[PDB]
């Protein structure tokens, strides 16, 4: 639904949807209709099908063709400054692909809006929804849009005969967590029967290890998920199924 979505939001109002409590299938998306840049940080793209994540934030916007470069944690530029701030140690994957066929229209699509003015650089994942008239000049404007008083929102002008570097690229940023809460999104890996009292390799919700599993007489409270030892070694687990 997000990837096939027809109507995309403006970059300064980049749309964020949470994804959770669903089996995901990343390999079929990685098998790509020539996505311009499926580029991943903090995780190897082939393995994405194996990890379990707590939640997967997905952010969507449409930007220039060649400006995709700016979507990086340690990056600078107008987009990184006044539109979208990827935090350092970002753990996710950036997807971009050209949408010249759909988005760009003859004469220039003008409804796409990117900002160019703000007091300071955006915070990590900051949404400057407000459209107050910028005091661009040294003199206060207080509602003036004169020659030295400027408006903070600017249209793009997507026309098909623009530069290839200026064609409309749709961009979707997937931000993972890799925390240890109940990991409610995970790949299509099958379940398996359980066996006890034997040294077996195991994966419980991406929590992997090797050991012998025995029935335990611990009194977990209902909100508990697993146990840990005096020196931080996983000692007991709750079976998911």
């Amino acid at each position, epitope marked *: 639904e997000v990837f096939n979505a027809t109507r995309f939001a403006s970059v300064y109002a980049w749309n964020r949807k949470r994804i959770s409590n669903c089996v995901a299938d990343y390999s079929v998306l990685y098998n790509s209709a020539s996505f311009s840049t499926f580029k991943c940080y903090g995780v190897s793209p082939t393995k994405l099908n194996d990890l379990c994540f707590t939640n997967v934030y997905a952010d969507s916007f449409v930007i220039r063709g060649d400006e995709v470069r700016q979507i990086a944690p340690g990056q600078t530029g107008k987009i990184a400054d006044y539109n979208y701030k990827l935090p350092d140690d970002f753990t996710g994957c950036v997807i971009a692909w050209n949408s010249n066929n759909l988005d760009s229209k003859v*004469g*220039g699509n*003008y*409804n796409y*809006l990117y900002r160019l003015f703000r007091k300071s650089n955006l915070k990590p994942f900051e949404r400057d929804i407000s*459209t107050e*008239i910028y005091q661009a000049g040294s003199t206060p404007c207080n*509602g003036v*849009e*004169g*020659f030295n008083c*400027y*408006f903070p*929102l*600017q*249209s793009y*002008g997507f026309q098909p005969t623009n530069g290839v570097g200026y064609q409309p690229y749709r961009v979707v940023v997937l931000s993972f967590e890799l925390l240890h809460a109940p990991a409610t999104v995970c790949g299509p890996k099958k379940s398996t029967n359980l066996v006890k009292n034997k040294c077996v390799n195991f994966n419980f919700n991406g929590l992997t290890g090797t050991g012998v599993l025995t029935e335990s007489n611990k009194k977990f409270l209902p909100f508990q998920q697993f146990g840990r030892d005096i020196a931080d070694t996983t000692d007991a687990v709750r079976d998911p199924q």
Partner: antibody
Amino acid sequence: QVQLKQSGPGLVAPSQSLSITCTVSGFSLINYAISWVRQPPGKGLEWLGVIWTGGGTNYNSALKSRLSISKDNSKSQVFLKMNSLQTDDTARYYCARKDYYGRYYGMDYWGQGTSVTVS
Amino acid sequence: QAVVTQESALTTSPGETVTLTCRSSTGAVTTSNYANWVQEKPDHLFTGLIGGTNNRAPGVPARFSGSLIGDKAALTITGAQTEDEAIYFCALWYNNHWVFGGGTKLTVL
């Protein structure tokens, strides 16, 4: 191609109201502002008013507050309204494109012109 | 504090350059009040010649050359035999609104 269009019947009798519209292609109302100029027969051009790029209107101070101008961001249309005419108001009216963002801060393009006559 | 004027008279033989001056009510004009030059064809055709009190418009030939030559705003066109037969208006940005010049008739040879 960048182009300005403006259309309206024009023929008006005294003391009633007619409105004129300006329709634009090749640019967005977000990247530019629109100003209107008026050309009476044989006399110099005078500035009517301007619509700012992202909301907010301006009007000529001496020009009556009993009038309004309006625009369409999505379909790129602009409408000028005069609610009561008098025989001195007969003139040709022109819409124009103003780019205060651009290095060429002044008005870039102008409308193709409409005749407005009294009786 | 609102008078705008032009000589309304211009005639230049080809090969020699001429300056026409538009004078406001504030004495010497500064770039702070932006100056504009527009040209009127006898068919009610308008175009932009000079902007920003020093900047030529896009698409108008560089033979058109306008600066703050005098104390007040001015424009200079090198002599042309055919295409200079037109009217020229000077525009000044007061703090609140725009004022347009009277218009100057050029009749080459």
